Structures are given as C-alpha cells and as structure tokens.
C-alpha cells in the first residue's frame, strides 16, 4: 500500500587503515655488544641490561 517504509540502513565503509606512532627511537642499545671497538674477552663477558 502507498506510503513511506523504512527498509534498511546506510553506512560508508572505510578504507586505508592508518597507524601512527611517535618518534620512539630513544636508546636502542646494541652497539655496545654487537660492534664494540675492542671485543670483550672470552671469560670476562660484559652484561648490559
């Protein structure tokens, strides 16, 4: 019959998910063990937290 009927809804689907992080490059301390200028001895290793 004549009139106005509500059938469904509408929704704009999104694209291009975006992830943003700050300049978190504070320390990254691996140059003291990986490529030390003078490598540590065999039995006196260096422990660096």
């Amino acid at each position: 019959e004549k009139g106005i009927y509500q059938t469904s809804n509408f929704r704009v689907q999104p694209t291009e998910s975006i992830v943003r992080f700050p300049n978190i490059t504070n320390l990254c301390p691996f140059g003291e063990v990986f490529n030390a200028t003078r490598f540590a001895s065999v039995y006196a290793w260096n422990r660096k937290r």
């Epitope: 003291e32 490598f39 001895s41 039995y43 260096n46």
Partner: nanobody, 116 residues
Framework: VQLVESGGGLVQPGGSLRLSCAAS????????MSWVRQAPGKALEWIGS???????YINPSLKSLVTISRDNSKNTLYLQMNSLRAEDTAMYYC????????????WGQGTLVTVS
C-alpha cells in the same frame, strides 16, 4: 692520569729497560692484568698475562725474553724487557682489569724511548 709509567730513554743497543705503575687498594687488581705496546708501523702484539695467583701464559712468538715480578701490598706489577734492540722507539702501556672487556679497562700514557 691514574696510571703513570717510569723508564726509558736513549740506550745503546743491548741495554735494559723497566716500567713502574702502581695502585693502592688490594681489591683493585681483580682479576686480570697484561701489557701492550704500539710501535709505529706495527700492529698489536700482546706478550703475556696473569691472574691473581700469578699463573702466566706468554705469546710463543716473542716469549724468549719475558720476566715479570709482582707485588700485592705495594699493589704493583712490573714487565721487565731486556736486550734493548733498535726497534723499541715507541710508547708502552700497562693496563688494570685488562680482560674485563671494552669498557672495563683503564689505559695509560707511557714514556718515550730512543734506540739506535
């Protein structure tokens, strides 16, 4: 510098030479000590090393003229090299806590030596 060395000078080929560097506390020499020198135009040449008890191992390449005396109360150790040849016009160094690693050793300055 907290580590000084005494000895050297112009010596006729064949003389003797000595170096003196000392510490103060009994526990500062834990646990490894050695010696090293850098002649101009020469790479690193390790000679010998010893632990607290005094057991020594020496590089076999130049192990014929090695003699070392050690003290504990004076907190010292001496590397004595004799028969001064014409290839020792460089600077020497003694090191405390040699094996502790890259950041666990303290270096010195040495003295000039003239050889003909």
């Amino acid at each position: 510098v907290q580590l000084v060395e005494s000895g050297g000078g112009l010596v006729q080929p064949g003389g003797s030479l000595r170096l003196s560097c000392a510490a103060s506390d009994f526990s500062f020499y834990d646990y490894e000590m050695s010696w090293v020198r850098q002649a101009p135009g020469k790479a690193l040449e390790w000679i010998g090393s010893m632990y607290h008890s005094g057991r020594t191992y020496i590089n076999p390449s130049l192990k014929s003229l090695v003699t070392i005396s050690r003290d504990n109360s004076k907190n010292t150790l001496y590397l004595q090299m004799n028969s001064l040849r014409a290839e020792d016009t460089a600077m020497y160094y003694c090191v405390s806590n040699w094996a502790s690693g890259s950041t666990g050793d303290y270096w010195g300055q040495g003295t000039l030596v003239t050889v003909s």
